[PDB]
Amino acid sequence: EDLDTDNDNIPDSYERNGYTIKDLIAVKWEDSFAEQGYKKYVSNYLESNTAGDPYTDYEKASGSFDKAIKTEARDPLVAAYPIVGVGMEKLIISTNEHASTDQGKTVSRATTNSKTESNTAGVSVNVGYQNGFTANVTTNYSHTTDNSTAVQDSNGESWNTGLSINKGESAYINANVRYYNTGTAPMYKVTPTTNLVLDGDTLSTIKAQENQIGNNLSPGDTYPKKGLSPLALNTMDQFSSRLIPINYDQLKKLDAGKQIKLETTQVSGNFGTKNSSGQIVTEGNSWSDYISQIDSISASIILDTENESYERRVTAKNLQDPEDKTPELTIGEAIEKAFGATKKDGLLYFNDIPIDESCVELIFDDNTANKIKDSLKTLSDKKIYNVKLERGMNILIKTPTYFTNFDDYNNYPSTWSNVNTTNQDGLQGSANKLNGETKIKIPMSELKPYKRYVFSGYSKDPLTSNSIIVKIKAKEEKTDYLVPEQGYTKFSYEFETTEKDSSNIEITLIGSGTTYLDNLSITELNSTPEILDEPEVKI
């Protein structure tokens, strides 16, 4: 009841059942400590660092480490682990190599990007949600370090008009990039190696030069900072490389809807350890030694939560081994433990955005589905959050930009037709009403120029009534007749937004039958290709 078999300053009996740190020390967890500010920690009593990170189960749980680590990384199951990647917000292509100006016809265009698009571009919608596994699967679940730019000047003109490249000459690529960090720890003395890659070929790989090595990268912060003039790609010095050359075919692909997408293969950095008196040393402490150790006993979870990206590592079980004493954890539990989620009514609010299997767009990979699908079989609850976490799982959360639950949350910049009363049957509080025609007019002046979106929601009619006729007109028209069922089911109808601030968007659930709508969401997934032809030659 007082023995410590791993010398982590925390007794095993506290380590097994749960504990907390009170004023410097481990104290047993009594539920009265909750709703007061203390978190219930529970770790592995046979090992020092339950998660694998450099810090022991006591340093994390108490906070006797760097003060730059996130609050959610104090849990002995969430790993202090930085995820670094490059993003591109300006593209320059010129016809010149050395002293790039004054000798060519340069074109430069400002771009925007997103770190989770390659993950959700391989998402096939497959509108069916059969066995309560109301999730979506992608083909290539990559990571948040795979940023994919999207040029936005690009009105109708191509890259050659004003460039004069015809099948023999090579333009040269210049850009202004801006690193980021979506993990929990900082990376000291960062030196990443990124690859600028077209459809399938590597134009050139950047290794951080002498001047571009940024000494500091705290989680949630970029290099340079939020107001500091992004880095010139090479800067064309004696430490720089030769400007990135591309050929005429790639030069047409860049107008053919194929995107450049930046990928950071490996990053090189350090971490900090105190010295009992506040002396922090960061030399010799490299992350490379812990990256493989951490990722091999963890489950990668990503939250997208538009306007910032988060990625976490949470330790797992490996039930096949008896001597693994890592506490088994549910997916709903690991999400809260990794993202600092609070419980509003037992629903894992992140900051105030609702996060549930019914509220957002979950995305998995094939090996995760081949363990979760055959887990929702022997369960008294069809919840995807009540599945047992195991190493190798990959879970992505796409939160919708526009969501409504008819209870407290409403994100649409307009309103619906009507809700018409105070309903309580939606599997979460209130749902919709108004048998008649229900509409909402989205200006499209707030969506994105050439992206695809998704409309999904939970719909039911308790007693076998009419089929609802949905009508969606953004770039196409949609006319579907879905029959509501006994349990609310996700429908996930797709559309596209093009034409660079086109007229409007029309989503109408015109269907009679006294049906119920709850948790209807709108979320962007892919960037749709747009074709640009430079001149039209007269004959």
260 is in an annotated binding site: no
Which residue lies nearer to Ca ion by CB, 57 or 357?
57
Query: Long-range contacts for 336-340 (Cβ within 8 Å, ≥24 apart)?
Result: 337/72, 337/75, 337/77, 337/78, 338/72, 338/75, 338/78, 338/301, 338/312, 338/313, 338/314, 339/72, 339/303, 339/310, 339/312, 340/70, 340/71, 340/72
Partner whose binding site includes residue 49, from a copy of itself, Ca ion, none (CB under 5 to 8 Å by kind): a copy of itself
Partner whose binding site includes residue 10, from a copy of itself, Ca ion, none (CB under 5 to 8 Å by kind): Ca ion
| Residue pointed to by tokens 């083909």 | 139
Q: ∠ CA 71-219-522 to the nearest 5 degrees? A: 90
Partner whose binding site includes residue 217, from Ca ion, a copy of itself, none (CB under 5 to 8 Å by kind): a copy of itself
The SS3 of residue 454 is strand
Which residue lies nearer to a copy of itself by CB, 284 or 535?
284
Q: How close are the terminal C-alpha atoms of the chain, in Å?
A: 92
Cα separation, 317 vs 296, whole angstroms: 11
366 is in an annotated binding site: no
Find, among 125, 126, 130, the residue nearest to 487 by Cα: 130
Which residue lies nearer to a copy of itself by CB, 163 or 187?
187
Q: Which amino acid is at 399?
A: T
44 is in an annotated binding site: yes
Omega into 224 within 30° of 0, i.e. cis? yes
- Least Å from the CB of residue 263 to a copy of itself: 6
Which residue lies nearer to a copy of itself by CB, 109 or 473?
109
| Residue pointed to by tokens 């060519």 | 104
Cα separation, 224 vs 527, whole angstroms: 27
- Compute how many other C-beta atoms are within 10 angstroms of the C-beta atom of residue 151: 20
Whether the CB-CB separation of 414 and 492 falls below 8 Å is answered with no
405 is in an annotated binding site: yes
374 is in an annotated binding site: no
- Least Å from the CB of residue 116 to a copy of itself: 14
Which residue lies nearer to a copy of itself by CB, 217 or 454?
217
Sign of CA dihedral 143, 149, 150, 152: positive
Q: Which amino acid is at 299?
A: A
Q: Which amino acid is at 137?
A: V
12 is in an annotated binding site: yes
- Compute how many other C-beta atoms are within 10 angstroms of the C-beta atom of residue 504: 11
Partner whose binding site includes residue 51, from Ca ion, a copy of itself, none (CB under 5 to 8 Å by kind): a copy of itself
480 is in an annotated binding site: no
Partner whose binding site includes residue 457, from Ca ion, a copy of itself, none (CB under 5 to 8 Å by kind): none
Which residue lies nearer to Ca ion by CB, 229 or 276?
276
- Least Å from the CB of residue 300 to a copy of itself: 12
- Least Å from the CB of residue 525 to a copy of itself: 18
- Least Å from the CB of residue 476 to a copy of itself: 31
Half-sphere exposure at residue 342, Cβ-oriented, CA atoms within 13 angstroms: 9
Cα separation, 188 vs 532, whole angstroms: 42
Which residue lies nearer to a copy of itself by CB, 168 or 535?
168
| Helices and strands, counts by H and E, the chain | 7, 27
345 is in an annotated binding site: no
Structure tokens at 493: 């109808």
- Least Å from the CB of residue 53 to a copy of itself: 6
- Compute how many other C-beta atoms are within 10 angstroms of the C-beta atom of residue 1: 6
Which residue lies nearer to a copy of itself by CB, 143 or 373?
143
- Least Å from the CB of residue 19 to Ca ion: 10
Q: ∠ CA 383-387-388 to the nearest 5 degrees? A: 165
Residues of this chain that interact with Ca ion (CB under 5 A) are 4, 6, 8, 10, 15, 43, 45, 57
Which residue lies nearer to Ca ion by CB, 57 or 356?
57
Which residue lies nearer to Ca ion by CB, 13 or 218?
13
Cα separation, 437 vs 418, whole angstroms: 9
Partner whose binding site includes residue 86, from a copy of itself, Ca ion, none (CB under 5 to 8 Å by kind): a copy of itself
Partner whose binding site includes residue 374, from Ca ion, a copy of itself, none (CB under 5 to 8 Å by kind): none
- Least Å from the CB of residue 148 to a copy of itself: 13
Partner whose binding site includes residue 15, from a copy of itself, Ca ion, none (CB under 5 to 8 Å by kind): Ca ion
- Least Å from the CB of residue 286 to a copy of itself: 8
Partner whose binding site includes residue 269, from a copy of itself, Ca ion, none (CB under 5 to 8 Å by kind): a copy of itself
DSSP code, position 484: P
Conformational region of residue 7, where left means phi above 0, alpha means psi within -120 to 50, and beta covers everything else: left
Partner whose binding site includes residue 187, from a copy of itself, Ca ion, none (CB under 5 to 8 Å by kind): a copy of itself
47 is in an annotated binding site: yes
Find, among 181, 203, 206, 172, the residue nearest to 94 by Cα: 172
298 is in an annotated binding site: no
Q: Binding site: what residues are annotated?
A: 4, 6, 8, 10, 12, 15, 44, 47, 57, 405, 407, 428, 430, 518
Which residues define the annotated binding site for Ca(2+)? 4, 6, 8, 10, 12, 15, 44, 47, 57, 405, 407, 428, 430, 518
